[PDB]
Coordinates of C-alpha atoms (C1' of nucleotides) in Angstrom, one line a residue:
Chain A
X18 CA 73.2 139.4 68.1
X19 CA 73.8 143.1 68.7
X20 CA 77.5 143.7 69.6
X21 CA 76.8 147.1 71.2
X22 CA 74.4 145.6 73.8
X23 CA 76.7 142.6 74.2
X24 CA 79.8 144.8 74.8
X25 CA 78.0 147.1 77.1
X26 CA 76.8 144.0 79.0
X27 CA 80.5 143.0 79.3
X28 CA 81.5 146.2 81.2
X29 CA 78.7 145.8 83.8
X30 CA 79.7 142.2 84.6
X31 CA 83.5 142.9 85.0
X32 CA 82.7 146.0 87.0
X33 CA 80.5 144.0 89.4
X34 CA 83.2 141.3 89.8
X35 CA 85.6 144.0 90.8
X36 CA 83.3 145.4 93.4
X37 CA 82.3 142.0 94.7
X38 CA 85.9 141.2 95.5
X39 CA 86.5 144.8 96.7
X40 CA 84.2 144.3 99.7
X41 CA 86.1 143.5 103.0
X42 CA 85.2 140.0 104.2
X43 CA 83.0 140.2 107.3
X44 CA 84.9 137.5 109.4
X45 CA 87.6 140.0 110.4
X46 CA 90.4 137.8 109.0
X47 CA 92.2 138.4 105.7
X48 CA 93.4 135.9 103.2
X49 CA 97.1 135.0 103.1
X50 CA 96.8 133.4 99.7
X51 CA 94.4 135.7 97.9
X52 CA 95.4 139.2 96.7
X53 CA 93.0 141.5 94.8
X54 CA 95.0 141.4 91.5
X55 CA 95.3 137.6 91.9
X56 CA 91.6 136.8 92.6
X57 CA 90.3 139.0 89.8
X58 CA 92.8 137.5 87.3
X59 CA 91.8 133.9 88.2
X60 CA 88.0 134.1 88.1
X61 CA 86.8 132.8 84.7
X62 CA 83.8 134.2 82.9
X63 CA 81.3 131.8 81.3
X64 CA 78.8 132.1 78.5
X65 CA 75.9 129.8 78.8
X66 CA 73.9 128.6 75.8
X67 CA 70.5 127.1 76.2
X68 CA 68.5 125.2 73.5
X69 CA 64.9 124.2 72.9
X70 CA 65.8 120.5 73.1
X71 CA 68.7 118.1 73.8
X72 CA 71.9 119.1 72.1
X73 CA 73.0 115.4 72.0
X74 CA 71.2 112.1 72.6
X75 CA 74.0 110.8 75.0
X76 CA 77.0 112.2 76.9
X77 CA 79.9 113.0 74.6
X78 CA 83.0 112.9 76.8
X79 CA 85.4 114.1 74.1
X80 CA 85.3 118.0 74.0
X81 CA 85.3 120.0 70.8
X82 CA 87.7 122.8 70.0
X83 CA 86.8 126.4 69.3
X84 CA 89.5 128.5 67.6
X85 CA 89.9 131.8 69.3
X86 CA 91.7 135.0 68.1
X87 CA 93.3 135.2 71.6
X88 CA 94.6 132.0 73.4
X89 CA 92.7 131.1 76.5
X90 CA 95.2 129.5 78.8
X91 CA 98.0 132.0 78.4
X92 CA 99.1 132.8 82.0
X93 CA 102.4 131.6 83.4
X94 CA 100.9 129.8 86.4
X95 CA 99.3 127.0 84.5
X96 CA 100.7 123.5 84.2
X97 CA 99.5 121.1 81.5
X98 CA 99.6 117.3 81.3
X99 CA 100.1 115.2 78.2
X100 CA 98.6 111.7 78.1
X101 CA 100.4 110.0 75.3
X102 CA 100.0 106.6 73.6
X103 CA 103.0 104.3 74.0
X104 CA 106.8 105.2 74.4
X105 CA 106.7 107.9 77.1
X106 CA 110.5 107.9 76.7
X107 CA 110.2 109.0 73.1
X108 CA 107.8 111.9 74.0
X109 CA 109.7 113.0 77.1
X110 CA 112.8 113.4 75.1
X111 CA 110.6 115.3 72.6
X112 CA 109.6 117.8 75.2
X113 CA 113.0 118.1 76.8
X114 CA 115.1 118.7 73.8
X115 CA 113.3 119.6 70.5
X116 CA 110.6 121.8 72.1
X117 CA 110.6 125.6 72.6
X118 CA 111.4 126.9 76.0
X119 CA 107.8 128.3 76.4
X120 CA 106.4 124.8 75.5
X121 CA 108.8 123.1 77.9
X122 CA 107.8 125.3 80.8
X123 CA 104.1 124.7 80.0
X124 CA 104.4 120.9 79.9
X125 CA 104.2 119.5 83.4
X126 CA 104.1 115.8 82.9
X127 CA 104.1 113.4 79.9
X128 CA 102.5 110.1 80.9
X129 CA 101.8 107.0 78.8
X130 CA 98.5 105.2 79.0
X131 CA 100.2 102.0 80.3
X132 CA 101.8 103.9 83.2
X133 CA 98.5 105.7 83.7
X134 CA 96.7 102.4 84.3
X135 CA 99.6 101.2 86.4
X136 CA 99.8 103.9 89.1
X137 CA 96.5 105.9 88.8
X138 CA 93.8 103.4 89.7
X139 CA 92.8 104.4 93.2
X140 CA 90.4 107.4 93.4
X141 CA 92.9 109.1 95.7
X142 CA 95.6 108.8 93.1
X143 CA 93.6 110.2 90.3
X144 CA 92.3 113.0 92.5
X145 CA 95.9 114.0 93.2
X146 CA 96.5 114.2 89.4
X147 CA 93.3 116.2 89.1
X148 CA 94.4 118.8 91.6
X149 CA 98.1 118.9 90.5
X150 CA 97.6 119.9 86.8
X151 CA 95.4 122.6 85.3
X152 CA 94.6 121.3 81.8
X153 CA 95.0 117.8 80.3
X154 CA 95.8 116.9 76.7
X155 CA 95.6 113.4 75.4
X156 CA 96.3 111.4 72.2
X157 CA 93.5 110.5 69.8
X158 CA 94.5 106.8 70.0
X159 CA 93.9 106.9 73.8
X160 CA 90.9 109.2 74.3
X161 CA 88.7 106.1 74.0
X162 CA 90.1 104.5 77.3
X163 CA 90.5 107.6 79.5
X164 CA 87.0 107.4 81.1
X165 CA 87.9 103.9 82.5
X166 CA 91.3 105.0 83.7
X167 CA 90.5 108.6 84.9
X168 CA 87.1 107.5 86.2
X169 CA 84.4 109.7 87.7
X170 CA 86.9 112.2 89.0
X171 CA 87.7 113.7 85.6
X172 CA 84.5 113.0 83.8
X173 CA 81.8 114.3 86.2
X174 CA 82.9 118.0 86.4
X175 CA 83.5 118.9 82.7
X176 CA 86.2 121.4 83.5
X177 CA 89.4 119.4 83.3
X178 CA 88.3 116.8 80.8
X179 CA 91.2 115.8 78.5
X180 CA 91.6 117.7 75.2
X181 CA 92.2 115.5 72.2
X182 CA 95.4 115.9 70.1
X183 CA 96.2 114.1 66.9
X184 CA 99.4 112.1 66.8
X185 CA 98.5 110.6 63.4
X186 CA 101.4 110.0 61.0
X187 CA 99.3 109.0 57.9
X206 CA 102.6 98.3 66.5
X207 CA 105.8 97.4 68.4
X208 CA 106.5 100.2 71.0
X209 CA 110.2 100.0 71.3
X210 CA 110.8 99.4 67.5
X211 CA 109.2 102.5 66.1
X212 CA 106.5 104.9 67.3
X213 CA 104.4 106.6 64.6
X214 CA 105.4 110.2 65.3
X215 CA 104.6 113.3 63.1
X216 CA 107.1 116.0 62.4
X217 CA 108.1 117.5 65.8
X218 CA 107.9 121.4 65.2
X219 CA 104.3 121.2 64.0
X220 CA 103.3 119.0 66.9
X221 CA 104.1 122.1 69.0
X222 CA 101.6 124.1 66.9
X223 CA 99.0 121.5 67.5
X224 CA 99.7 121.5 71.2
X225 CA 99.6 125.3 71.2
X226 CA 96.3 125.1 69.3
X227 CA 94.8 122.8 72.0
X228 CA 95.9 125.0 74.9
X229 CA 94.6 128.3 73.4
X230 CA 91.3 126.8 72.3
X231 CA 88.1 127.1 74.3
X232 CA 86.4 123.8 74.8
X233 CA 82.8 122.9 74.1
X234 CA 81.2 120.0 76.0
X235 CA 78.3 118.2 74.3
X236 CA 76.4 117.3 77.5
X237 CA 73.0 115.9 76.5
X238 CA 70.8 118.5 78.3
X239 CA 69.6 121.8 77.0
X240 CA 72.2 124.0 78.8
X241 CA 75.9 124.2 77.9
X242 CA 78.5 126.6 79.3
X243 CA 81.8 127.7 77.6
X244 CA 84.8 129.2 79.4
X245 CA 86.0 132.1 77.2
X246 CA 88.1 134.4 79.3
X247 CA 88.9 136.0 82.7
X248 CA 87.9 139.1 84.6
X249 CA 91.3 140.8 84.2
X250 CA 90.9 140.7 80.4
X251 CA 89.6 143.8 78.6
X252 CA 86.0 143.9 77.6
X253 CA 86.9 144.5 73.9
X254 CA 89.0 141.3 74.0
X255 CA 86.2 139.5 75.8
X256 CA 83.5 140.6 73.4
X257 CA 85.6 139.6 70.4
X258 CA 86.2 136.2 71.9
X259 CA 82.5 135.5 72.5
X260 CA 81.4 136.7 69.1
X261 CA 83.4 134.1 67.2
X262 CA 82.5 131.5 69.8
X263 CA 78.7 131.8 69.5
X264 CA 78.8 132.1 65.7
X265 CA 81.0 129.0 65.2
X266 CA 79.8 126.7 67.9
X267 CA 76.2 126.5 66.6
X268 CA 77.5 126.2 63.0
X269 CA 78.8 122.6 63.7
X270 CA 77.7 121.4 67.1
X271 CA 74.2 122.7 67.7
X272 CA 71.7 120.9 65.4
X273 CA 69.1 122.8 63.4
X274 CA 71.3 126.0 63.6
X275 CA 69.3 128.8 65.2
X276 CA 66.1 126.8 65.0
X277 CA 67.1 125.1 68.3
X278 CA 69.0 127.9 70.0
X279 CA 67.5 130.2 72.6
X280 CA 68.8 133.1 74.8
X281 CA 72.4 133.4 75.9
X282 CA 73.7 134.4 79.3
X283 CA 77.1 135.8 80.3
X284 CA 77.8 134.0 83.6
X285 CA 80.1 135.0 86.3
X286 CA 80.9 132.2 88.7
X287 CA 79.4 133.8 91.8
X288 CA 77.2 136.5 90.2
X289 CA 73.9 136.6 88.2
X290 CA 73.5 136.0 84.5
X291 CA 73.1 138.8 82.0
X292 CA 70.9 137.9 79.1
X293 CA 71.6 138.0 75.3
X294 CA 68.4 136.8 73.6
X295 CA 68.3 135.2 70.1
Chain B
rC1 C1' 133.1 34.9 109.9
rA2 C1' 136.1 32.1 112.9
rC3 C1' 142.1 30.0 118.3
rA4 C1' 143.4 31.7 113.0
rU5 C1' 141.2 25.2 111.4
rU6 C1' 146.1 26.4 106.2
rG7 C1' 138.4 25.8 107.6
rC8 C1' 133.6 28.5 106.0
rG9 C1' 130.0 32.5 103.8
rC10 C1' 128.4 36.6 100.2
rC11 C1' 129.0 40.2 95.5
rC12 C1' 131.4 41.1 90.7
rG13 C1' 135.0 39.1 87.0
rC14 C1' 138.6 35.6 85.0
rC15 C1' 141.4 30.9 84.2
rG16 C1' 142.3 25.3 83.6
rG17 C1' 139.8 20.9 83.0
rU18 C1' 134.3 16.4 78.4
rA19 C1' 131.2 22.6 80.4
rU20 C1' 125.6 27.9 80.0
rU21 C1' 124.7 24.6 84.7
rC22 C1' 130.0 20.7 87.4
rC23 C1' 134.9 20.9 90.1
rG24 C1' 139.3 23.4 91.7
rG25 C1' 142.0 27.9 91.6
rC26 C1' 142.8 33.1 91.0
rG27 C1' 141.8 38.7 91.0
rG28 C1' 139.1 42.9 93.1
rG29 C1' 135.7 43.7 97.4
rC30 C1' 132.4 42.9 102.4
rA31 C1' 134.7 45.7 110.7
rU32 C1' 133.0 49.6 114.0
rG33 C1' 132.2 54.9 115.6
rC34 C1' 131.9 59.8 113.6
rC35 C1' 132.0 64.2 109.7
rU36 C1' 130.6 66.5 104.8
rG37 C1' 127.9 65.5 100.5
rU38 C1' 124.8 62.2 97.0
rU39 C1' 120.6 59.1 96.6
rC40 C1' 116.5 56.3 98.3
rG41 C1' 112.9 56.9 101.8
rA42 C1' 109.4 57.1 106.8
rG43 C1' 106.1 60.0 110.0
rC44 C1' 97.1 60.4 112.5
rG45 C1' 105.1 66.4 112.8
rU46 C1' 103.7 71.0 110.1
rC47 C1' 102.1 73.6 105.6
rA48 C1' 100.0 74.8 100.6
rU49 C1' 96.4 73.5 96.8
rU50 C1' 88.3 76.2 94.8
rU51 C1' 93.8 80.9 89.5
rC52 C1' 90.7 88.4 92.9
rA53 C1' 95.7 88.3 86.0
rA54 C1' 95.6 90.5 81.1
rC55 C1' 92.2 90.7 77.2
rC56 C1' 88.0 98.6 73.7
rA57 C1' 90.4 101.8 68.5
rU58 C1' 98.2 102.1 70.7
rC59 C1' 94.0 102.9 65.1
rA60 C1' 90.1 101.8 61.3
rA61 C1' 86.2 103.7 57.9
rG62 C1' 83.9 107.7 55.1
rC63 C1' 84.9 112.5 53.1
rC64 C1' 86.6 117.4 50.9
rC65 C1' 88.7 121.9 46.6
rU66 C1' 95.4 116.3 46.3
rG67 C1' 97.1 117.8 51.7
rG68 C1' 96.0 119.3 55.5
rG69 C1' 91.7 119.3 58.0
rC70 C1' 86.8 117.3 59.2
rU71 C1' 82.9 113.3 60.9
rU72 C1' 81.7 108.4 63.3
rG73 C1' 83.6 104.8 66.3
rU74 C1' 79.7 105.7 73.7
rG75 C1' 83.4 104.3 77.1
rU76 C1' 82.2 108.0 84.3
rU77 C1' 82.5 104.6 92.3
rG78 C1' 79.3 106.4 96.3
rG79 C1' 78.1 110.4 99.5
rG80 C1' 78.0 115.5 101.4
rG81 C1' 78.1 121.3 101.5
rA82 C1' 72.0 128.3 104.5
rC83 C1' 77.1 128.7 97.9
rC84 C1' 76.1 130.8 92.1
rC85 C1' 72.9 129.5 87.5
rG86 C1' 69.8 127.8 82.8
rC87 C1' 65.5 124.8 81.3
rG88 C1' 60.9 121.9 82.3
rG89 C1' 56.6 121.0 85.3
rC90 C1' 54.2 122.8 90.3
rU91 C1' 48.4 128.3 91.3
rG92 C1' 52.6 128.9 94.2
rC93 C1' 56.1 126.9 97.8
rU94 C1' 58.9 123.4 95.4
rC95 C1' 60.4 119.1 92.6
rG96 C1' 63.1 116.8 88.1
rC97 C1' 67.0 117.6 84.0
rG98 C1' 71.9 119.5 83.2
rG99 C1' 75.8 122.8 84.7
rG100 C1' 80.1 126.6 88.2
rC101 C1' 82.8 126.0 93.2
rC102 C1' 84.4 123.0 97.6
rC103 C1' 85.2 118.2 100.7
rU104 C1' 85.9 113.0 101.5
rG105 C1' 91.1 106.4 101.9
rA106 C1' 87.3 102.2 96.4

RNA sequence: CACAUUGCGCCCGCCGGUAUUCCGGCGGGCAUGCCUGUUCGAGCGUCAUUUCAACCAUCAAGCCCUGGGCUUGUGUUGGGGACCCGCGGCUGCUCGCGGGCCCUGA
């Protein structure tokens, strides 16, 4: 991987995204809810990794976490959802009182698995939860049963799939819930939000969301460098002996190659 | 109950006489219509009765550089959209495998 050809590939892709939005739309009617600064700031940039064989024998619904130097979901206009285990009362008081003001404004809804199976069963109900929140975090005790509850709506698109979080200390619900120290739960939640997620879909092609078009190319290139060097360290089998060329992918534009 | 005659039934209990059975007496009760409630019922009057529930891991095990992190626990309704891709075949058009966006009452 040559960083100079990678970073010069970054400028060409963000520049084309800017000009692609800069063209007047040919229908003669403007958009009320799409400004130029808004639509560039909200288009995500993908990097697509292809392999010589299957990266996994079967679908792994639980996504892995990639530690980034810069957090990914950092904008103000994102709302997160926390799927907890039992006592939602215990964890809603946790958010409301002993959390920082930044974390409280990030949290949109804390929901226990029992209430999730109680009022999100219809596909219309879980579609409304899908559209309402931006990202989803979920307990490690509960990540087993989310595909049955959330259904096809969350687990066919691989974009809002729930991110695991570890509420492991080392069960009667109302007696005592096994909760870790509170201020370091916030660091774990902040770690999950800022991480870029990998999806171990069985086929040869995987795509990672790494940044946005309004970000600087230096901060984009630094993010993708640690992503591609650390993802194939643990997730891709046979290390480079399975990997093939990379492609930086815009959502509506062509793919720029990075061969390996 | 009976022109009411000091007569005669029925239920429970008691007393005195050779008395568990007999005789006589005594005490408390037994009219009709209607109301409220209790209890026992009757009706080829009407109804219900073939259980659409919950029931994965609200944590276990193995590890590492002794305390935090890691790995495994395979679990998704169907359909549609001159949209953007990667990979396999197809002489090629294209078709399969997985993605990015959008829509719809399970």
